[PDB]
């Protein structure tokens with residue numbers, strides 16, 4: 049009524065925070081090499097979708113609600129709805145992709161992580177957007193022509209086939225409920241698998257540590273990341289050569305926390321490959337389980353496959369599934385005497401077949417930390433609206449208009465609190481933002 053200016057300021061500010069927030073994320077990733085990871089590519093996609101929501105959906109919806117009707121016409125109305133639903137679907141599918149990524153990472157620690165590249169990412173993102181569009185856009189814009197008549201009037205804006213509540217609910221289930229269910233199930237599996245969370249990566253970063261700067265090994269050779277051997281030369285540049293060959297970029301000698309893990313997975317994959325092509329090592333590797341297979345890989349990491357091959361006697365004891373004796377036998381090596389601590393854990397891993405010899409990081413991954421917040425925010429903000437649809441199926445009068453409006457703004461602001469989560473669950477994003485404002 050007379051209080052219009054207030055609403056406009058609030059909604060305007062909110063839309064402003066959203067747009068500058070996501071653009072800040074997209075830029076933060078583009079301009080900072082440290083933030084350039086496949087996980088952040090997903091967040092980049094999310095930021096795009098959320099940006100569009102801030103510029104278009106929020107603003108136009110505000111206009112539609114403050115003015116009491118739709119002044120902009122049918123064509124712009126149809127584009128607006130398409131855009132909204134297309135990007136919303138893109139968002140939920142991105143959440144799905146992230147979920148599948150976590151599942152494979154957790155379930156296939158050795159094989160999967162190595163094949164996670166920027167290319168696969170961009171393609172999965174591409175499929176997400178394209179597929180979403182294909183589903184919503186055509187139906188939303190052309191439904192009128194399909195049926196031959198337009199049910200939507202000149203002052204109102206809504207999806208035409210949604211005129212029937214049953215169809216709207218059905219669509220909610222397929223578009224929102226099912227993906228949520230699926231995300232629940234596979235995250236249930238992810239939970240089961242990670243209850244006592246240690247993986248070959250955590251293990252090797254404990255034993256060999258994780259250095260982002262070239263450090264001379266006890267043997268005297270050049271090394272990087274998680275015990276990655278470079279060269280034997282006394283000239284640093286001789287190492288910088290091999291390093292820049294593995295990175296594909298001029299590092300000057302220093303790499304990021306992400307390039308370290310990309311190199312790590314490369315070593316792991318290569319490790320396994322060689323073990324399988326190795327006649328002494330293959331049989332025992334075939335017989336061992338995931339945890340004990342990791343322990344073996346650890347040994348190959350430290351002393352090399354030619355060294356590990358020298359443990360034929362103990363290896364045969366492993367294949368016989370005699371764990372305690374295999375341990376006793378392993379401790380008789382000088383390897384045990386020259387690297388007591390690490391050896392004890394690896395041997396113990398062989399002994400028990402569990403990760404119980406290794407202490408958890410005590411601080412969860414940035415990726416898992418972020419993912420959780422994203423999901424919480426998504427479900428808490430979208431559930432109200434969707435359960436509103438459910439209830440609307442049997443009782444329309446129960447849900448007033450003011451309620452629908454609230455539901456809409458919840459779904460909308462979820463695009464606002466995303467960059468907030470990145471900054472809170474990831475110190476690098478926050479830092480980058482801070483420096484980006486200046």
Ligand SMILES: O=C(O[C@H]1CN2CCC1CC2)C(O)(c1ccccc1)c1ccccc1
Pocket residue numbers: 132133134136137138140216217219220221223224225430433434437455456459460
């Ligand atoms: O949450 C939904 O709709 C919201 C998303 N957008 C546009 C309508 C509302 C508010 C913000 C959503 O569950 C939905 C809503 C109504 C009918 C069917 C599905 C949905 C829509 C598209 C893609 C994924 C989910």
Ligand SMILES: OC[C@H]1O[C@@H](O)[C@H](O)[C@@H](O)[C@@H]1O
Pocket residue numbers: 274275276277278314315316318319320322348349350
């Ligand atoms: O097999 C594992 C080994 O593979 C090599 O490619 C790496 O340079 C080593 O650091 C790693 O320990």
Ligand SMILES: [Cl-]
Pocket residue numbers: 164165166167
């Ligand atoms: Cl890549």
Ligand SMILES: [Cl-]
Pocket residue numbers: 413414415
């Ligand atoms: Cl981290």
